[PDB]
Write a protein that binds this ligand. Sequence first.
Ligand SMILES: *[C@@H]1O[C@H](CO)[C@@H](O[C@@H]2O[C@H](CO)[C@@H](O[C@@H]3O[C@H](CO)[C@@H](O)[C@H](O)[C@H]3NC(C)=O)[C@H](O)[C@H]2NC(C)=O)[C@H](O)[C@H]1NC(C)=O
Length: 138
Amino acid sequence: VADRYAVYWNSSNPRFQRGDYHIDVCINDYLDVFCPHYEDSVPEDKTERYVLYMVNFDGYSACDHTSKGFKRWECNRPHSPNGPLKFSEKFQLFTPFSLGFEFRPGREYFYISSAIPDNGRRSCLKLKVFVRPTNSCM
Ligand SMILES: *[C@@H]1O[C@H](CO)[C@@H](O[C@@H]2O[C@H](CO)[C@@H](O[C@@H]3O[C@H](CO)[C@@H](O)[C@H](O)[C@H]3NC(C)=O)[C@H](O)[C@H]2NC(C)=O)[C@H](O)[C@H]1NC(C)=O
């Protein structure tokens, strides 16, 4: 957890349950988000699915995924064949591709999700990521 940070994005995770999950990372580190994953023996009704978004602080604060940001990943395979669906975020300064994001050191970024079956629409799981300043990373 000094290059790759594992984040299990589901409501049974106490860190998300508490509603203030936050992590510090260094440029070039990776954030690996693991979508909810279940055994076939699971009741659907109890299968979590989410869309994950990156928003600004106000959107993060208000669980607003409609006003501004980007849809980043879709946790839509609760029974994915080889382990949970996993999305990776690399905190890099430059990206040569258009499907990517570039980060700046000494800045915080925000992520929130909306339930896919769209339930109780109001509260949300969320995550704050602070990219430490260059140097404050040894
Ligand atoms: C909801 O979030 C939970 C909170 O973490 C998930 O539980 C964690 O599952 C992890 C993966 O199965 C376990 O971590 C380790 O992951 C590495 C990476 O592949 C494995 O090698 C390890 O074997 C595995 N176990 C360890 C730590 O050695 C965690 O142990 C486990 N943590 C907790 C808090 O129980 C749930 O899976 C997730 N639930 C749903 C519905 O997806």
